[model samples]
Target: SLVCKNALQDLSFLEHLLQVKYAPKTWKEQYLGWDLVQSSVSAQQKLRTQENPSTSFCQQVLADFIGGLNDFHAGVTFFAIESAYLPYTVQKSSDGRFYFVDIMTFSSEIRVGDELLEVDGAPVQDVLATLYGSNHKGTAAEESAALRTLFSRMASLGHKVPSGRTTLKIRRPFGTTREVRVKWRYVPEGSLFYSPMVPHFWAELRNHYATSGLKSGYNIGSTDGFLPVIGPVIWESEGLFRAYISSVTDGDGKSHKVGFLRIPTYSWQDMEDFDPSGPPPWEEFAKIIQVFSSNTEALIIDQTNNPGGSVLYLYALLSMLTDRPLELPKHRMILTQDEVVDALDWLTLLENVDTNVESRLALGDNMEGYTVDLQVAEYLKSFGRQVLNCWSKGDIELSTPIPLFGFEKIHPHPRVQYSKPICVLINEQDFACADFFPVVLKDNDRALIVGTRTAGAGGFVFNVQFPNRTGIKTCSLTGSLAVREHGAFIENIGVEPHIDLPFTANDIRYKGYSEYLDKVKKLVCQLINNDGTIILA
Candidate 1:
């Protein structure tokens, strides 16, 4: 009888009814009742009633709702401009101001440190304030960090980038103000771009070469999606690995050779040109290590703007750097029957036709023994019979130790005994698998971390495409530093740096980032000269 009521406005009451009928033990503890559901319903209603809501608006509403539930992976995307369309990243200065940190395209007017004042006639600060107001979760600093990313890409927040031209109001350091109109272009459907590190941001301003135009050569509608082509040698090559090497001379005319490696993503093997027949990531990294060990005394591993990739690369990179055997923490996943079905359906589509049949079969066999608990299954079945037949109450917990199953016996690289001082560069954009690397290095006293705190988004995630043709990415498993206790997760609390960079408004106004790099290099040299011991400021 309770289920007969309108499920839209009275859904909160239905949850109470269901809780009372089944999970009575934890009903009061878990139930939010009308208070929470009303707020969610109100937010959803606001989006639904908005005049001519764009696909981005609808998607953001879904993202906000899901994110409000503390689901880190829960996100919505609807025909937003992909990486190829507009490749760049933005940074918010310590003084609550925003700036374009890196501009990938051929735009001379848009430089780093030019304060972003307005976009499309709307105040940039207002747009950010709206975003922050809607999503009222996470720390103030974390929300600001997330907002800075959203502000960088126009289409990321559903703001339509007018075709052909977009105007921006910017203020230069010397207090000169100017409005620059940038030419915008759409990405062709099937085209691909390749780089060793993540091309989301410009790693080196010196390496920013001018492009002919903002146009993709490939034809549209030729493929389902655009995939990046990545390899170790794509950026620059030393031996078997890809890296960027440069020499910085101090004030005393002493040129110090610095080797830089940008690990943009860990899921390197997923790149379109990744040769399955060739050597593994570790083998390539081993070559890089050999070259760095012999050639350079100070090394910088750049993880700025790196989105997490495969866990395999994490272990491989750590092994190449650390001499001692590392015991990685275990990872756990919580899934429901519906989620399992959704995953299998997606996997089937991925393995369609004459693809790698062996890999598909291995994946199937691997999940064969995973079954839901009896009580959980029964509760879900009961709920399904009475209400909508969904995997509402069923949950299964899965755990896997580090190095994974096949990689357990693997050890650190035999020849990589480089004991030279190392410095890791990171920022708020470094997350997922990217964030994990710094955690490992910091915990083991392997390297000195310098930069802003990371974007603490490490977790095991699963993507779900809803019936509306909109997809929602959700995290099913929580992850942490392996050596720590169970509750020690890396969700909202990011990795703290050993030497924190200055982020105050005053510091950014007069200082350039080159000063920080110089300080880091000087510290590394100091460590090398003092038998690897120095006080962290």
Candidate 2:
């Protein structure tokens, strides 16, 4: 009964939201969707009839049932009836000054880390008291962390964005109080892609001859130094692209430099006429690298906050740098018996609905897996966006397992003997595949890592699509299995760097140097001649 009740509640919630927002005419035709066990009524009846099931056992069963659905974003957390909630990430600096990391919202600019010292002319302590109310019970750190998480979750769910202007005031470590005013703007969707590395940006700003030159936004760099190359920072926009390479000054004060590669996501109409792989204004990346790799002491590859695109470009770059070649693993498809039947039925229905010859054949082949061409898949991708309508757990199959063999070769033997020392820079904000990078680097022993833990969980849970158009999204746990199989431990906890240099607020405000980057570069240089025995501070 409880199961049925909860199921009904969930359906009702979706229905209500849809009614308030979307008005698709086919709502009544949609299936109720499936769960791991059985229908809610069946599950409830089974539980009742079973011999004295303990509450804990029942709860465990419920958890497994939900887990079977594998929706990364779908889940529930139960708390004691009287639990309290708070907002923010509280950090105490080495000097014992408490700080909060503001979650971006509509009014987030007003309360960002920059404005912590001033809010409505009230001190942070006073602000916390106001938000939590007078009787709230929690340490400042606990309260801040809780409220921040809550606010962030709300923002992530697209529930609310703080609006308008606000003021914040805080007392400095030495006992000086400061107030600041901030205006809020909508946090762009692009921000969710990844966090940028400011120093990398600074490095580009200082460079004149770097490929793609210096510019703002996300970047990835490449070079022919240690490991055949280093990608410093590469940022791209529709009309603009830039990269950064910083000076690597040794203890002797002699400076060595690297290069950059800038890419634009889209092309302006006039620029579209230029060859995609030509010199400057076309793809002027190689020149910067050729110049720097000529005599650099070491290389730094900064994928600091790269939002992924065209692994094809990366593969080509990697091939050029490496003595050998490598490729991406081919993805596979998993299916269930029911899925096969459903696929057939869906194909027939689609062909009947749309009489075009191509449409009929396309649907028929998609289900039967015959006469299917890769180009057709690509073409169809431009139009028919497949959405997962519901969860239907089943087995998976790989069409082929293409080996990404030379990845291991990125370390050891010939690769390690290059003239350039290699190091990687990372921080809390680098997320998604960028977050998984540390583990990859560590596993391969390809580069020395520096900076703070990443913000993302090691991998992602994919939401799969169903053909039924039921308007329900199916979430699945895809990343965890791969990570576990590969012996990568970063999950809810982040990848820890070889050298841990936590970032400070002042570093951000002033765009000052990070000890993390400095330490890594130093260590990489030191290790070039040694047997990796040099001590790192």
Candidate 3:
């Protein structure tokens, strides 16, 4: 059953592209000291020799091959067409058991926060292994996500089960358990957004990628992985983001008011402003800041379900949170000829800028030491460093850890609000840009990071397409490793929260995330009261 020679050669092209253009080889092999999936020529040769391979077989081959890299940014599009999902989403709590986090118009008998006992008569763990073990195997936390998306009946991670229905056994918060049979919720293919978001097209094509560090490498199958905990928002932007006020009483018998901002994703399109009237989102962001910065004593930046977005935008939000200078992350990349050309191109853009340039032209005369020209100059200085040394010759290039807006030493955004005391929340779903936000805060001691570790997606992604159409058509690659504080890479390693708080079964069962937030509220107040009110000066 040799379906077609084209299918065999297609994967071969992928293998070749990954070996030649995949930039993280040195970091993955030398730093991590691990063998990459693409380095195996024997597997490639064996794949070609397989007998009677079907499209599904070829698809599985592609999925397993790419998934083995164990890098979240590495992604592949297979032949499988996902059409439905289990009606609800499941989450693992600190109690070491699974609980229902979301329910979609399912039978009223099942409720959120119920302990999931089994699916189709087997333990959820064993079922996940039997279903997707072949294609994906990573951290324990990754399994929770896989189970959520896997049973959702959609297979964007390259694993697909043909069945449209399943039986669920679950334990309620009470004392009893019940079993219910339910059909997977059907969603037509192309009905979802695994198209994933790409920041730039030219960078992917030219293969020497450079742009704002803003991005998420892979498209997750489920929603946010974690839910939002907020009061009635004074304002919300159609779920793009939400803002509200919350108050807490401490053990010392004092009531403290704090502003809460729940940002779902960092991926917003019109995040910046070009004109004086400014873009609506930026204007509203400014408006939101005025209220919270003045009304509340501290701010809680909720970045729980955020899948990352544009780095430039991340800088904008960061500037609004603190008065101190932000030293952004520098990346380690194996430079290509295209990178050199682009670096030079950036210099030209910076050097040739006249008053006509929109970014510089539209500046509000910002502050005493901040200017768009200085921002342009910083980018130019970094690009020069990126292009200055060429002798490394197929080795890693160090990018300058420059400021996002302007001079790192100056107060970048003077108009920023709520700098008194801030707390950021993160979880496994917070990847890419979301991962970077906390790193900046913690490194500068600008805020207290609470909750779990972020999904350590250290860098942006690059697109890959097979030379020929076959079982595997296109995929994405982990282009580089982002350098965090004290020589840490954000790729395989993610952010460790200052306050390590994972959800427990009891925490979810009671009032959902409300009680959890209350704990955080008290904790923030305690820390701030104990002279943990760290100052930059």
lDDT of 3 by residue, 181-225 (tens): 776545454500112323221113112111212122112312223
- Which portions of model 2 show Cα errors greater than 4 Å? 1-156, 172-174, 179-247, 253-288, 308-317, 324-394, 397-419, 456-480, 483-493, 504-509, 514-517, 528-533
lDDT, ranked from best to worst: 3, 1, 2
Q: 1-537, model 1: which lDDT tens digit per residue?
A: 121122122323322322222111121123222233555576557554676654445545554543443323233333444322344445566557766655655667677667778867777766666555343544544565445444233343333333456668888878888898765444332200011212122211101112323222111111111111111222347333336556655446676666776565566564323477886655666666677787777677766656566554565577677666554444433334443454344345333333234433434321211211222223223322322222243422222212222232224555575567687877766656677788777777778888778765455443322233332221121221232364334334478778877455543443354455566666666664554646753
Candidate 3: list runs displaced more than 4 Å: 30-33, 37-51, 131-140, 155-157, 186-240, 270-280, 352-359, 362-371, 391-411, 484-492, 533-537
Question: How displaced is residue 251 in candidate 2, in Å?
Answer: 2.7
Clashing pairs in 3: 85-152, 86-152, 214-310, 214-311
| Deviation (Å) of 451 in candidate 1 | 0.8
Range of the 10 consecutive residues with the lowest summed lDDT in candidate 1: 217-226
Winner on lDDT (1 vs 2)? 1
Specify the poorest-scoring 10-residue window by lDDT in model 3: 205-214
TM per candidate comes to 0.63, 0.48, 0.80
TM-score winner between 2 and 3, please give it.
3
lDDT of every model, 2 decimals: 0.47, 0.35, 0.57
Cα RMSDs of all predictions? 11.3, 14.6, 7.0
Better of 2 and 3 by lDDT: 3
